[PDB]
Symmetry: C2
Subunit: 111 residues, 2 copies
């Protein structure tokens, strides 16, 4: 919800805070170069959690690859199987917290 700020008089503005998040994809090591081009730019609200931001990134990867579904099957990639995978998003140092540069992978951020 945008925060309404009244300055007295008669004028009222409402602001919303976002953060420009750039994601480097490590999903398949092959089609990652095209994911870092077509669905690598995001802008998320400050109050959002990573568990819910991983969903819009998930929907964007499939919507990016769905038109070219038939050129993925020779590579062994199944969008139906990819549609239900667990997309993890962690910091540049490796932690499930929002940040500028984040990594996307099917596996947790190591240990």
């Amino acid at each position: 919800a945008p925060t309404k700020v009244t300055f007295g008089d008669d004028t009222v503005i409402e602001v919303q805070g976002y953060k420009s998040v750039n994601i480097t994809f490590e999903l398949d090591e092959r089609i990652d170069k095209v994911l870092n081009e077509k669905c690598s730019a995001y802008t998320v609200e400050l109050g959002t959690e990573v568990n819910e931001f991983a969903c819009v990134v998930a929907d964007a990867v499939i919507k990016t690859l769905q038109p070219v579904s038939e050129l993925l099957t020779p590579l062994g990639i199944d969008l139906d199987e990819w549609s239900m995978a667990t997309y993890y998003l962690f910091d540049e140092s490796g932690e499930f917290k929002l940040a500028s540069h984040m990594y996307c992978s099917f596996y947790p951020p190591d240990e």
Copy 2:
């Protein structure tokens, strides 16, 4: 369109200016009481013109009176004429410039 403010780092904020407008009605001088109570509070963008503002106040007046349209016919009010009538909005001094307090009437602000 909300103006985007890049503060460096990765934080982007969207700012949109609005203006609190309350309109004292001069439409019928019998139902002007119930109009000043249920559709006299608006929040308009700083750049909106009055001729376009008159269209949302017009719809808000008819949509306020439509659920009780059958009680307006004994008073001599027909929405089908109000639905197609022309609504003027002017400053406290009779100018076509937005302000906190404006008037609404079927006639221009005198001469």
